[PDB]
């Protein structure tokens, strides 16, 4: 069985998004640093607790795939300061996303979450992301480049034992699926802050968590072409928290204009010509 690739964030930036690429996954040693874990962990905390199940009753887009012992909390930037400074800003993930989206244009984020699953949560089914959200993406030549990739963010440890997800390296070429099997998977072994990347066509499920006790937590962040609408929205972040993030940072939560990569590119969600934060004079780097 060949494991998955291991990669060092530091030392082998340039061979991060190749690997994938090539295999379909690689794991990215401290992709996150103990410190920027532990401030996450501890901001989300309380949202993650009164979340209800996915497809609580009060809710008006209920997720009807996610079993009920998964809990799941996006639109982060509001509620972690870590996340929207920190991991926005990543220079790792900033590299990895730019080498692999550079074909298309600019990318954002279509959705980071934090997945807690509580002890005894069930294996996932093998899947491929982005099906209950773009269809358009299964209308992509088979050999389209990755329109979104997905960094799987340990925030607490995965072990065999506690569900550590599963993957089948290849898999995101495979056209024909009658190999599809969990025999054909290994598994993601890391300690909080190493980060699985994979991508939209890479087939993985979360694990089974064997132990009874265990709660596993981390952080999905699916990056993807400013050409594909983001899961989640954040049109209802107070504007002093959008105003206090990087240039950068706002263009990835939608709140900047985006640009393709056409020579005579015309751009995305523009104004009469000018951009989001020229035409509303936003601010930017100001402290709350
Ligand atoms: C249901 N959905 C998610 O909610 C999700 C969660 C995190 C990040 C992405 C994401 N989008 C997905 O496409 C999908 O995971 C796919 C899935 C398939 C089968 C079982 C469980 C999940
Ligand atoms: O639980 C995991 O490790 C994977 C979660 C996942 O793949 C999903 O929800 O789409
Ligand atoms: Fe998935």
């Given at each position: 069985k060949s494991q998955i690739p291991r990669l060092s964030a530091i030392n082998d930036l340039h061979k991060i998004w190749?690997?994938?690429?090539?295999?379909?996954?690689?794991?990215?040693?401290?992709?996150?640093?103990?410190?920027?874990?532990?401030?996450?962990?501890?901001?989300?905390?309380?949202?993650?607790?009164?979340?209800?199940?996915?497809?609580?009753?009060?809710?008006?887009?209920?997720?009807?795939?996610?079993?009920?012992?998964?809990?799941?909390?996006?639109?982060?930037?509001?509620?972690?300061?870590?996340?929207r400074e920190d991991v926005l800003n990543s220079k790792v993930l900033h590299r990895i996303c730019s080498d692999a989206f550079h074909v298309y244009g600019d990318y954002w984020v279509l959705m980071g979450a934090v997945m807690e699953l509580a002890p005894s949560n069930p294996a996932q089914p093998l899947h491929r992301d982005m099906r209950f959200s773009h269809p358009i993406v299964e209308y992509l030549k088979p050999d389209a480049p990755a329109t979104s990739i997905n960094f799987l963010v340990a925030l607490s440890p995965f072990t065999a034992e506690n569900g550590a997800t599963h993957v089948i390296l290849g898999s995101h070429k495979w056209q024909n699926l009658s190999n599809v099997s969990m025999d054909a998977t290994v598994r993601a072994l890391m300690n909080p802050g190493d980060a699985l990347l994979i991508t939209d066509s890479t087939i993985h499920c979360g694990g089974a968590e064997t132990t009874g006790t265990e709660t596993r937590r981390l952080l999905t962040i699916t990056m993807g072409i400013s050409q594909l609408t983001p899961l989640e929205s954040n049109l209802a972040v107070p504007r002093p928290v959008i105003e206090s993030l990087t240039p950068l940072a706002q263009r990835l939560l939608g709140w900047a204009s985006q640009r393709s990569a056409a020579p005579r590119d015309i751009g995305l969600l523009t104004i009469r010509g000018n951009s989001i934060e020229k035409t509303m004079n936003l601010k930017a780097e100001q402290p709350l």
């Open positions: 190749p690997t994938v690429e090539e295999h379909g996954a690689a794991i990215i040693e401290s992709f996150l640093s103990l410190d920027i874990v532990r401030r996450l962990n501890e901001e989300v905390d309380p949202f993650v607790k009164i979340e209800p199940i996915p497809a609580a009753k009060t809710k008006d887009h209920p997720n009807h795939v996610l079993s009920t012992t998964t809990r799941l909390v996006n639109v982060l930037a509001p509620i972690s300061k870590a996340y």
